[PDB]
Amino acid sequence: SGFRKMAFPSGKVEGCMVQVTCGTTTLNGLWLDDVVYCPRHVICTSEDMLNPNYEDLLIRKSNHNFLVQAGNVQLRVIGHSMQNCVLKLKVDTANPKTPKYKFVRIQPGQTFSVLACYNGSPSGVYQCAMRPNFTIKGSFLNGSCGSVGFNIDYDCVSFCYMHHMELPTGVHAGTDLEGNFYGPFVDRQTAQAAGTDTTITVNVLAWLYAAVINGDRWFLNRFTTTLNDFNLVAMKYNYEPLTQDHVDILGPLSAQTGIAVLDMCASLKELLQNGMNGRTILGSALLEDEFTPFDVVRQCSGVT
Amino acid sequence: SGFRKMAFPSGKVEGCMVQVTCGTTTLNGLWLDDVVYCPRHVICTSEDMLNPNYEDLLIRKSNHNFLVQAGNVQLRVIGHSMQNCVLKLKVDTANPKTPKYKFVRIQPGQTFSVLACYNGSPSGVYQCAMRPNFTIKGSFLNGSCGSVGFNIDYDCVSFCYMHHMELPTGVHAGTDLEGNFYGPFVDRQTAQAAGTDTTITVNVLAWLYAAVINGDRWFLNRFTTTLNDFNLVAMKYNYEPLTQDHVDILGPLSAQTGIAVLDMCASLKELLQNGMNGRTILGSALLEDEFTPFDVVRQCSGVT
Ligand SMILES: *CC(=O)N1CCN(S(=O)(=O)c2cccc(F)c2)CC1
Ligand SMILES: *CC(=O)N1CCN(S(=O)(=O)c2cccc(F)c2)CC1
């Protein structure tokens, strides 16, 4: 019993983290096979960062200007290319610790683990969600860029995020491992405002199911609702619209608990309308939206 | 910027997790050098667990009854002893992945990472605190016993917890790696009630400092207080008494923020008395007490 904000074990990703230095800028790189992936802004002087022309900046860079260090051993860079907002540094040595891996571009609402790194060295691991406005709420100081977000399916690491940017509002923006930003963000030190950070309704519902399974049941009410009625309340409270697809995804949790999804919707409706009245659910005074239905089933069933 | 509930990178501990089977009971073991540590209740039939005499049960067990599997390879058990509530299984092979390590017995309020495991395989990592009533609020299903809690200082893993028990109230009890329970708990399926789960005041204050550093400042007020006045309010709200030792430990955060510890105390006092009024601090509607002052400095400074 008990339900914790839980990250994937980080070992497989720890084995991939390197330090990348171009000129005076040091950040993190991901070493998979004989390629090191890192943010292209590694080539910028903080001056350059105001209006960088990366293709022009890159012309002035040779393989030998990219200093790649795996622990205390230097890797030989034998090639470099820009793909969107990442550099791919070809090294002469395949990472011996390369796990089975995929690059995936996640959807908003999807959760992942971040391995926060500085100088290619892991400092911590935490669980994130891709927000509906394509930001993440991370913990990233200077030097953390190139830290990656991942999911693990048994022995295959799906890399979904690389850290690039802090917005002026202290929220985080980054790319997939093909170097494409999540959302409208660009790797330039300019005015970039986030859109509405709406709540991930399907994740809240998953987490209410987790609470019932772990004995927290005070919020269960005598009511039901419809998708359309619920969605009127969701709209009012800056919750994402709930779709039949979301209802379908919550099916297994509905089955295990015997609480119809639309009944749990009606409970969430009362929680929005009435608040928590100083009570808590799984040790939270607010409605948690950084657990997916898949996360709830995983943790509640104990997948390794 | 940003402040996350952050676990240590788990790789060094992943490399130590094995499966231990005695009869029909499978749980987790920690393999350090040529010793595998596991809960002694591995030898019990759930019947035995009602009133086990472990010394008597152990007489019926030989080295060959302890099945130890590291991945898909079996370890040869060449010795076994009981130390308090853990078994130490001597194996003929030193764990090649043994990190630098220590066994430490932590104090209540101290935080650590748990690597939740099933069948010797890591499923997730989360951050815990030793509660003032010597329980932890974990995520542990059947098979998770022998999962360990740890801190890392650069390259040295300090093992502080091994999971043994769920209390009827769904909170968790376990031992240090010398097999001594935290608190009054025993490895027997009997009535064991937890004492008052008081809030770790020094940790709340650390986390209020983290909030100021990350730009969450709405709760800062015009007031100060004294340790004695604050402690009267703490008592009333089931907060641990604040000592000069706690004030001393918060010194570095006080220095960096320019907020006197007793000023932050007065802010916490108003938060207790007035509540959050529907506002949040670092995305929390309650006062977080599972960050130590050391955790706040670590994450805010970026130690690896
Ligand atoms: C995005 C990121 O982590 N980095 C690495 C550090 N550099 S920097 O320009 O070297 C720098 C160092 C210290 C303080 C700074 F504000 C920047 C920026 C990109
Ligand atoms: C404490 C712990 O994790 N374990 C391992 C599992 N066993 S058990 O007796 O094999 C068991 C299996 C399934 C369901 C159970 F309730 C118990 C108990 C000790």
**Ordered DSSP codes for A134-200:** S-B-----TT-TT-EEEEEETTEEEEEEEEEEE-TTS-EEEE-TTSPBSTT--SSSS--------B-
CA distance linking residue A17 with residue B21, whole number of Å:
35
CA distance linking residue A262 with residue A247, whole number of Å:
8
Phi, psi of A148 (to 5 degrees): -120, 155
Cβ neighbours of A151 (radius 10 Å): 21
**Structural resolution in Å:** 1.7
**B10 at A interface, C-beta within 8 A:** yes
Contacts of B4 (CB under 8 A, 6+ apart): A114, A124, A126, A137, A138, A139, B299
The CATH label, of 3.10.180.10, 2.40.10.10, 3.40.50.150, 3.10.129.10, for the domain at A1-14+100-197 is: 2.40.10.10
According to the CATH classification, is domain B198-301 in 1.10.1840.10? Answer: yes
CA distance linking residue A140 with residue B303, whole number of Å:
12
Per the CB < 8 A criterion, the answer to whether A42 and A163 are in contact is no
Of all ligands present, the nearest one to the C-alpha of A22 is 1
Active site annotation includes A145: yes
For residue B240, what are its two tokens? 């641990």
Option in B5, B118, B215 nearest A304 (CB): B118
Q: Give the residue range(s) of CATH 2.40.10.10 domains in chain B.
A: 1-14+100-197, 15-99
The strand pair at B100-103 and B156-166 is best described as parallel
Per the CB < 8 A criterion, the answer to whether B93 and B77 are in contact is no
CA atoms within 13 A on the CB side of B76: 4
Name which of B296, B103, B121 is nearest A11 in CA terms: B121
Burial class (CB in 10 A: 0-12, 13-18, 19+), B71: exposed
**B99 at A interface, C-beta within 8 A:** no
Kindly state which CATH superfamily the domain A15-99 is placed in. Answer: Trypsin-like serine proteases (2.40.10.10)
CA distance linking residue B174 with residue B146, whole number of Å:
9
CA distance linking residue B21 with residue B59, whole number of Å:
17
CA distance linking residue B163 with residue B136, whole number of Å:
10
**A137 at B interface, C-beta within 8 A:** yes
For residue A231, what are its two tokens? 């969605």
Q: Give the residue range(s) of CATH 1.10.1840.10 domains in chain A.
A: 198-301
CB–CB of A9 and B14 under 8 A?
yes
Distances (CA, A) of A241 to A228, A236, A237, B279: 9, 11, 11, 24
Active site annotation includes A85: no
CB–CB of B170 and A1 under 8 A?
yes
Per the CB < 8 A criterion, the answer to whether A205 and A264 are in contact is yes
CA distance linking residue B17 with residue A63, whole number of Å:
40
CA distance linking residue B255 with residue A13, whole number of Å:
36
CA distance linking residue B244 with residue B146, whole number of Å:
37
Cβ neighbours of B290 (radius 10 Å): 22
* Beta strands, E only, chain A: 17-22, 25-32, 35-39, 66-70, 73-75, 77-83, 86-91, 100-103, 111-118, 121-129, 148-153, 156-166, 172-175
CA distance linking residue B99 with residue B104, whole number of Å:
15
Phi, psi of B86 (to 5 degrees): -115, 150
Of all ligands present, the nearest one to the C-alpha of A120 is 1
